[PDB]
Design a protein around this nucleic acid. Structure first.
Ligand code: MG
Ligand code: MG
Ligand code: MG
Ligand code: MG
Ligand code: MG
Lengths: 117, 100, 51, 55, 88
RNA sequence: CUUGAGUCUCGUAGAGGGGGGUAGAAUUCCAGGUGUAGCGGUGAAAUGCGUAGAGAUCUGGAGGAAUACCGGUGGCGAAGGCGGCCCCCUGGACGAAGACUGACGCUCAGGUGCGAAAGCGUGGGGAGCAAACAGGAUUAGAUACCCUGGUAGUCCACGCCGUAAACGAUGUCGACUUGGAGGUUGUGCCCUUGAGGCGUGGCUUCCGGAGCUAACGCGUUAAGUCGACCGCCUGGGGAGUAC
């Protein structure tokens, strides 16, 4: 297709779901995969295993781009926050950098109340 | 008069102005019975973050001792001079010299 | 929280995030806020920190 | 620790995340800890130091 | 507070002599200074209540000073008011 | 007269107050790129947003609000309360040597002023959050808690409202009465060789003796021992209600 051989790997470790997107060092998403979309829903979709099957499932798409090495961009808590990385590398990927782009405001917007039981 | 440790950094592709700016300010201050106690031209320099774009800035020092008026008249020029970007001006604390 | 670590070696060195951002702060701002709850519930940690 | 231009002395009171290092994990006196913080704050605005390690 | 210059200056213009900062008259003077100078600052802002507290204190304090002077020497009191145009 | 109170000189610390600038992190919104079938949410769900291409991802821009870290057993203020950085205007407190006034003091019904949040008026502003309201879910029901949205308001200027578990549930000023450990800020002195050691003022935590207390507990920052002035209580309900 383009044969990038080296891009980045964004990981959305949301408290409920986990999606992994692979894109060149530019930003242009090459391919993506999501936990909830990889089968199990609700309860099971928000587990560490969930993200794993997703990560590998993503590579089965971007690997066709001749991707060899790639960095790792992670943000957010919840499971699959770290898991995704392992499966990503173990799946045969020359990893290099890993940074937590988790958004942390120096006190700005007021978070929502919610949860009260 | 009240001392003011001013440190203004100008746009990189404007470095040629740095000399002009300085010579003017200094004179303007002295003209009003000012009294410069320091001066440093750190010139170009890497930037921690791309403030107002670019990753390089031309820094300059001052640390004068003139009446609030003139220095205040200057606090505005730095704003109406596309060339100069971020600016700051601390207070007296007794004229400092050398080092930095 | 950067982690490049030259030379190949399957070690995450994740401990870094666990010493600043990530949870603690993230989990903190997750749900609602406090407004007054900290000056107390949080300032009550000393009543314990004493010993 | 008292001056802001001294980006060298301040880099000691800053974790590899931009945030300033607590006073309890440096012994540094309270009186000094406050003065030191200010130097780091105004220094960050002069782009002489990073707000965080990300940007 | 007040400028050292104006301070020392007004110290003699009313002080029983020189470097005798403390005379009932001296005080009143030093008080009326900031008392009148502050108005200029208070005319503006207005919502600076916390700073008003100080203003009011010196105000009342002055009254308590004059009231005293008049009790210990009706002379200086009547003469002091003039140089300051106080008492209405 | 000088020890009470105040004045002057020189410093010290401070999220004290008023005004004006300004920086970075994030959210949301708009536009475009990459990319494709989900995303969002929960205990599950569902409403909802997605092929009219969301979500994720990158770039550019707009805008409002709040200032991670430092930060604390912390600091400042009369109380309410006050946290990014910079400038201007300004109030208080403390120490130090001393110099000066010479009881100018303490308290204070009435009075005057300050007063969290919510609320009200005028004109602005409006990102996020959210009374009301509308859906979805839960339940026997669910006019709720939970989820998806969302107006007032929250922000600003000026004016009004004067209340709160406005609390230390403990009025202000002053003098006395064994201790211990700690925080914070000033200061005299000593090879500080180095931090340090001998102290000496201000503010402030925790423990505790005597004594006080119905007990719990308070305990040199007293609720102990005393003095000056003030406010207030006199069974529960009715009722901080009616007139
Ligand atoms: Mg709601
Ligand atoms: Mg209000
Ligand atoms: Mg209104
Ligand atoms: Mg206090
Ligand atoms: Mg006790």
């Amino acid at each position: 297709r383009k044969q990038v051989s080296d891009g980045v790997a964004h990981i959305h470790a949301s408290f409920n779901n986990t999606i992994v997107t692979i894109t060149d060092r530019q930003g242009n998403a090459l391919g993506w995969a999501t936990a909830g979309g990889s089968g199990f829903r609700g309860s099971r979709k928000s587990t560490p295993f969930a993200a794993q099957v997703a990560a590998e499932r993503c590579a089965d798409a971007v690997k066709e781009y001749g991707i060899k090495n790639l960095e790792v961009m992670v943000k957010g808590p919840g499971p699959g926050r770290e898991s995704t990385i392992r499966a990503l590398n173990a799946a045969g990927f020359r990893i290099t950098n890993i940074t937590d782009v988790t958004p942390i405001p120096h006190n700005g917007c007021r978070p929502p109340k919610k949860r009260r039981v | 008069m009240r001392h003011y440790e001013i440190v203004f950094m100008v746009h990189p592709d404007q470095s040629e102005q740095v000399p002009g700016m300085i010579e003017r300010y200094t004179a303007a201050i002295t003209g009003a019975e000012g009294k410069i106690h320091r001066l440093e031209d750190w010139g170009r320099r890497q930037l921690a973050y791309p403030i107002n774009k670019l990753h390089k800035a031309h820094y300059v020092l001052m640390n004068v001792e003139a009446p609030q008026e003139v220095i205040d008249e200057l606090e505005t020029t730095f704003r109406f001079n596309d060339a100069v970007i971020r600016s700051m001006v601390m207070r007296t604390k007794h004229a400092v010299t050398e080092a930095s | 929280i950067k982690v490049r670590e030259n030379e190949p070696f399957d070690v995450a060195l994740r401990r870094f995030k666990r010493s600043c951002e990530k949870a603690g702060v993230l989990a903190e701002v997750r749900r609602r806020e406090f407004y007054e709850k900290p000056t107390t519930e949080r300032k009550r940690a000393k009543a314990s920190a004493v010993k | 620790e008292i001056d802001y231009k001294d980006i060298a002395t301040l880099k000691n009171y800053i974790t590899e995340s931009g945030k300033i290092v607590p006073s309890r994990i440096t012994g540094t006196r309270a009186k000094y800890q406050r003065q030191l913080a200010r130097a780091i704050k105004r220094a960050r605005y002069l782009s002489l130091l990073p707000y965080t390690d990300r940007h | 507070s007040l400028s050292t210059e104006a301070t020392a200056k007004i110290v003699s213009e009313f002080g029983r002599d020189a470097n005798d900062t403390g005379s009932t008259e001296v005080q009143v003077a030093l008080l009326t200074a900031q008392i009148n100078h502050l108005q200029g600052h208070f005319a503006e802002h207005k919502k600076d209540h916390h700073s008003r507290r100080g203003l009011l204190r010196m105000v009342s304090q002055r009254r308590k000073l004059l009231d005293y002077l008049k009790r210990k020497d009706v002379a200086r009191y009547t003469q002091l008011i003039e140089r300051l145009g106080l008492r209405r």
